[PDB]
Structure 1
């Protein structure tokens, strides 16, 4: 019966909104499923706990539910509720029909078949959306410890999409071959120290992911190669066609000392300035060659 504290308030399993299992219908796989909760039922994403799981997996599933349920921000995926009293156990989330941001960027790259699928403003809007969520976490003293394109989701694929932070596993914090080293600042991988300025660093890496249209950070480098590179002052080059003003946000996010990195209010200010600049937003994204 673990307690969870966020923004000075403590909650437990009893605070989670239990939805009767009979009101929940699974529609398709997306494990995660599209579902409906009951003339116009609510469309949801359903995250499931495998019945064949360990006891730690059970506790981790509960904690995930507690964490997400206590956030209240338009750029953090909503929790509709849970169904923990039937098996397999469910967490019911906001349906994000656009899927994860990394997959979206890769699949929606400008190609000859789709020459204007995305523009710079689309990318700056995604960046602003996630920075807004990050500012909310910072203001509420929550350290994400796992900001990355794979952990962000889109409301829909088409125009008007809103990006949100969707996953809260805190993968960077060991307090390893699964460690997301490519998103971690020096103090995190060396000393295991995390603060809101460690989220700033990771946001810089996300910005690179966005403006590269979904490339893996540090092209051709392994995890240890990246660790040694970043420790010695090495930084990524700009993504292809990346405007100078946008690259400078990245390089500010990657200052060696945490105190020299911007907070999320400043990041948002800088993203807004880029969004206003015609030379930035009139920059064409590269076209990835393919058939008509």
Structure 2
């Protein structure tokens, strides 16, 4: 099974095989299973269950090829693989800040920590992911699942850098059911016609922006997948998250334009995030205290 990215072909032989003896698992991180490990290089170890089908094996190899071929500061690095021993491993850059979805919920301003997060922290996370999305767009790669659950943070503190850390949906499409599709992150032409372009990621980026500025709420509060599908197809859009500055909400509503041609590309999105970052009326807005 070969892989093509940016018109360059790669195969399992191009993956960096790390000797199994050099790898130590330290603790579980979540669910196959994921561990924090060591090679010393700190890594996140993605495992392939030994009890798997041949399709699961090919999917695992395809995931390794996809991540290893990217080269961008906002896309998780692949340290290598351990495919010559069972269970097979994919070794990723250990993102000590964990997933973005959990970070937003755990780091929400509270009476004990009123300034735990500010608008600038959120704008920096949005810029970081938009930079990763821009890299994918300029290399003609469609992510198909831009969402907070798929983003990682280098550290919990102010110097944190956000990165795209999962490419499962893209791997599946490269090569399954409607109840597993990320309906709440998809534009109308994607769930209706199965039409995917770089403008599909623009729409999903708008939804991720809402997730960031809501501090980790599930999109379309109280709506099921089919309710969202009918709502979005009929022109319905989410309200601004609590205390969301107008200029930031305006980026979201532009990402959610019905026609893909009316949605901005990632260069324009980055330009608009930069302007929000400069505006004192935006960054001086206090986040809600839960």
Q: Does 1:48 align with 2:47?
A: yes
CA contact under 8 A between 1:134 and 1:264: conserved in structure 2?
yes
TM superposition shift of 1:54: 1.4
Distance change (3 Å), C-alpha of 1:157 and 1:185 = same
- 1:272 aligned to 2:274? yes
Change (3 A) 1:163 1:263: same
Q: 1:174 Cα deviation (Å)? A: 6.7
Deviation at 1:173, TM superposition (A): 7.6
Consecutive unaligned residues of structure 1, counting only runs of 5 or more, are none
Aligned to 1:177, the other structure's residue is in SS state helix
* TM-score for both structures, normalised by structure 2: 0.96
Decide whether the 8 Å contact of 1:173 with 1:192 is kept in 2: no
| Secondary structure, counterpart of 2:168 in structure 1 | coil
> 1:281 maps to what in 2?
283
Q: CA deviation at 1:171?
A: 6.5
Contact kept? 2:151, 2:162, Cα under 8 Å: yes
Contact 2:142 2:170 in 1 (8 A): no
**Distance across 2 between alignment mates of 1:169 and 1:62:** 12
Contact 1:106 1:214 in 2 (8 A): yes
Instruction: Flag the 1:190–1:173 CA change in 2: closer, same or farther, 3 A.
Output: farther
Report how far residue 55 of structure 1 moved: 1.3
The whole-number CA distance in structure 1 between the counterparts of 2:169 and 2:47 is 19
Alignment length (residue pairs): 284
TM-score w.r.t. length of structure 1: 0.96
Aligned partners of 1:80 and 1:93 also within 8 Å = yes
CA separation in 2, counterparts of 1:218 and 1:256? Answer: 17
Counterparts of 2:70 and 2:233 in 1: how far apart (Å)?
Answer: 34
Secondary structure in 2 aligned to 1:18? coil
RMSD: 1.2
Could you say if the C-alpha distance between residues 68 and 233 of structure 1 is closer, same or farther in structure 2, counting changes exceeding 3 Å?
same
Q: Deviations over 1:118-148 (max 9, x none)?
A: 0000000000000000000000000000100
The answer to whether the Cα contact below 8 Å between 1:120 and 1:284 also exists between their aligned partners in 2 is yes
Once residues 254 and 174 of structure 1 are traced to their aligned partners in structure 2, the CA distance between those partners, rounded to angstroms, is 23
* Change beyond 3 A, Cα 1:171–1:70: closer
Contact residue 123 and residue 273 of structure 2 kept, 8 A: yes
Q: What CA deviation, in whole Å up to 9, does each residue of 1:66-103 have, x standing for no partner?
A: 00000000000000000000000000000001110000
8 Å contact kept, 1:130–1:165: yes
Task: Please tell me whether the aligned partners of residues 171 and 179 of structure 1 are also in contact (alpha carbons under 8 angstroms).
Answer: no
Uncovered stretches (5+) of structure 2, i.e. residues with no partner? none
